[PDB]
Amino acid sequence: PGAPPGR
Amino acid sequence: ANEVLLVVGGFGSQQSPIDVVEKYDPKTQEWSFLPSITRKRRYVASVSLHDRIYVIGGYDGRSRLSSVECLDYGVWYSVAPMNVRRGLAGATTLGDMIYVSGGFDGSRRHTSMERYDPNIDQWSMLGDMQTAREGAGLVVASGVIYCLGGYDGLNILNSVEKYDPHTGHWTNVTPMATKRSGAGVALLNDHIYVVGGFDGTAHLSSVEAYNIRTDSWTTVTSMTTPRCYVGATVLRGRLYAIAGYDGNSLLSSIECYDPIIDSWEVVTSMGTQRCDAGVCVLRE
């Protein structure tokens, strides 16, 4: 989305 | 009278959606654990309505969820699902109904907003926003719904929209100074506060305040640390920023905004590090 961490 | 803070789900330590539910009592300044939600949910929202905690939408690591579940302030149970799968949607209360707008369903961002009526247990579609937004904030100000910021799949947004019930459409208002996604949104006195977020390149600690009376934006003393996908709420008249991502690590911090001396200080920390978790305030 923006700077949200990913998994 | 006492007001409690509730933090539900989110993205955890172990780089995974979590089901943890924590309660902060400021009177005791103490944290407590509640029964965990039935499904691990990141990108989730949460609201308080008639001493009920509603956990709305989210993403479980596999799908983004139509499902909504409820706890009476305890046991967690599901209620009527939304018409749209919504991850990173804005949620608020108006009258005695729940309003949820925007979000991402795994393939397209949403202009839709919908309304939950508890007396009939129903989700009803309403008017669409001009721009689809995920990670946008929802707040109520003078009986009117505002949705702020977000991300449309292309650019981070400084756009702010306000809903007109008499027409079923949204009208634009003065945009924010900084485009923000995953910012926390709350109403404190006569100002809508937007805290933190992400502007496309940097994780923000900046805070903006929109004056309800003058319809003008101001910059406020920034938070103690950058926070994106941070919760924002008001407890007993004080603005609180809850957890989030500081650009490098998840955050435990809960910090408070002191209006009289105009400063931020970290007041407490939870037992878990989370970002994009649902936040709500409940009256005891």
Curated annotation (Swiss-Prot), chain B:
Organ and tissue specificity: Ubiquitously expressed. Highly expressed in testis and at lower levels in the submandibular salivary gland.
Domain of life (superkingdom): Eukaryota
Region (Interaction with DVL3): 122-284
Processing and modification events after translation: Ubiquitinated by the SCF(FBXL17) complex, leading to its degradation by the proteasome: ubiquitination by the SCF(FBXL17) complex takes place when aberrant BTB domain dimers are formed.
Kelch repeat positions: 4-51, 53-96, 97-143, 144-190, 192-237, 239-284
Subcellular localization: Cytoplasmic vesicle, COPII-coated vesicle
Chief place of localization: cytoplasm
GO function terms (MF aspect): identical protein binding; ubiquitin-like ligase-substrate adaptor activity
Keyword list, A-Z: Cytoplasmic vesicle, ER-Golgi transport, Kelch repeat, Repeat, Transport, Ubl conjugation, Ubl conjugation pathway, Wnt signaling pathway
Segments forming a coiled coil: none
GO annotation terms (biological process): COPII vesicle coating; endoplasmic reticulum to Golgi vesicle-mediated transport; neural crest cell development; neural crest formation; proteasome-mediated ubiquitin-dependent protein catabolic process; protein monoubiquitination; Wnt signaling pathway
Pathway(s): Protein modification; protein ubiquitination
This protein's GO CC annotations: centriolar satellite; COPII vesicle coat; COPII-coated ER to Golgi transport vesicle; Cul3-RING ubiquitin ligase complex; cytoplasm; cytosol; intracellular membrane-bounded organelle
Subunit details: Component of the BCR(KLHL12) E3 ubiquitin ligase complex, at least composed of CUL3 and KLHL12 and RBX1. This complex interacts with DVL3 upon activation of the Wnt signaling pathway by WNT3A. Interacts with DRD4, KLHL2 and SEC31A. Interacts with PEF1 and PDCD6/ALG-2; interaction takes place in response to cytosolic calcium increase and leads to bridge together the BCR(KLHL12) complex and SEC31 (SEC31A or SEC31B).
Domain free text: The BTB domain is required for interaction with CUL3.
Role according to the record: Substrate-specific adapter of a BCR (BTB-CUL3-RBX1) E3 ubiquitin ligase complex that acts as a negative regulator of Wnt signaling pathway and ER-Golgi transport. The BCR(KLHL12) complex is involved in ER-Golgi transport by regulating the size of COPII coats, thereby playing a key role in collagen export, which is required for embryonic stem (ES) cells division: BCR(KLHL12) acts by mediating monoubiquitination of SEC31 (SEC31A or SEC31B).
Protein name as catalogued: Kelch-like protein 12
Residues of the full protein shown: 279 to 567 of 568
